[PDB]
Amino acid sequence: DTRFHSFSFYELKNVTNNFDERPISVGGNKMGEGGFGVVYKGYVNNTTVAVKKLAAMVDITTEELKQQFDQEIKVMAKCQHENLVELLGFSSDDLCLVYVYMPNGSLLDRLSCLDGTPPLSWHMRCKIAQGAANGINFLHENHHIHRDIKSANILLDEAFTAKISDFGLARASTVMTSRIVGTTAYMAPEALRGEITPKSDIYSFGVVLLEIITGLPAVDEHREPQLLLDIKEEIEDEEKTIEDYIDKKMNDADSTSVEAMYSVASQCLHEKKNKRPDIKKVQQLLQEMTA
Numbered sequence: 001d002t003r004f005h006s007f008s009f010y011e012l013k014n015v016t017n018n019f020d021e022r023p024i025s026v027g028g029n030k031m032g033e034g035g036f037g038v039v040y041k042g043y044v045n046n047t048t049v050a051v052k053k054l055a056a057m058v059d060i061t062t063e064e065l066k067q068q069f070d071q072e073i074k075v076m077a078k079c080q081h082e083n084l085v086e087l088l089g090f091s092s093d094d095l096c097l098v099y100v101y102m103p104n105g106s107l108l109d110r111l112s113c114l115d116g117t118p119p120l121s122w123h124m125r126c127k128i129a130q131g132a133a134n135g136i137n138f139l140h141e142n143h144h145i146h147r148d149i150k151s152a153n154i155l156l157d158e159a160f161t162a163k164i165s166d167f168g169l170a171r172a173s174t175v176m177t178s179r180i181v182g183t184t185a186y187m188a189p190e191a192l193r194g195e196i197t198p199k200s201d202i203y204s205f206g207v208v209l210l211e212i213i214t215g216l217p218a219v220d221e222h223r224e225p226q227l228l229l230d231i232k233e234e235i236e237d238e239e240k241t242i243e244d245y246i247d248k249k250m251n252d253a254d255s256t257s258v259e260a261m262y263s264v265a266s267q268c269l270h271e272k273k274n275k276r277p278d279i280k281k282v283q284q285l286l287q288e289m290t291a
């Protein structure tokens with residue numbers, strides 16, 4: 001389809017079985033949730049869609065949420081690429097965004113094997129890492145800073161192609177902000193300080209690469225270390241090796257390409273923003289990894 005659709009709130013209420021908050025397996029429509037809303041499964045033109053019902057689930061106001069709704073429509077109309085999620089339409093008559101359905105959910109869900117899905121192979125993980133970098137490259141080439149790169153915001157289509165999502169906090173382009181937003185466990189030190197730079201998206205992508213390698217979430221309150229980015233120091237201070245942390249749920253990892261991905265992640269995670277590779281270099285390094 002070649003146009004954006006304006007849906008009435010009643011149609012979206014109807015096709016999501018009245019925004020049925022029960023999970024998919026019990027006969028509900030809830031697919032997941034983020035900091036800015038619940039995502040529901042919908043069925044429109046004999047077509048499955050994803051419907052995000054916006055809600056300030058984190059620490060933001062009604063005006064900030066409406067601003068993110070506007071920003072997401074604007075950024076998604078402007079940024080249409082094979083490694084970005086596709087906006088289909090919207091409803092504002094109770095704010096809703098309607099997207100092309102991603103049948104394999106998020107990278108975060110697949111790394112956790114949520115609902116009994118089989119673990120992703122190392123081969124699949126390399127392809128996803130490359131696809132995600134290509135999406136970030138398009139945004140950076142088009143002077144957009146994502147500001148919320150994380151595994152929950154990397155979606156997977158019918159062919160497990162990586163599709164970057166959640167453009168509500170995205171910024172057109174180093175500027176400083178009095179409004180520090182994002183997910184702590186993934187944020188660069190300068191972003192936690194209020195800086196707005198594409199260099200911070202690189203850092204956050206480094207944390208995603210560690211999640212891909214290890215299968216571990218960026219943060220776990222009942223784990224030691226609680227933060228995944230700390231493993232870079234554990235490995236640097238030779239108290240651990242990458243082999244100690246490689247996801248045991250894969251059978252096809254090899255030391256050469258795993259060490260190549262870890263080297264990319266390490267460079268992305270440089271504490272000094274100017275020493276980090278830019279996205280074009282990250283793409284080159286990830287392409288060389290499987291060459």
Ligand SMILES: C[C@]1(CO)Cc2cc(NC(=O)c3cnn4cccnc34)c(N3CCOCC3)cc2O1
Nearest residue numbers: 024031032033039050099100101102103105106165
């Ligand atoms: C296997 C299934 C069913 O159990 C299929 C499925 C699709 C989506 N998402 C979408 O289809 C989707 C498409 N565009 N989009 C934009 C933002 C968020 N989600 C989406 C999600 N998401 C929910 C929100 O958090 C991320 C994962 C989970 C999920 O699980």
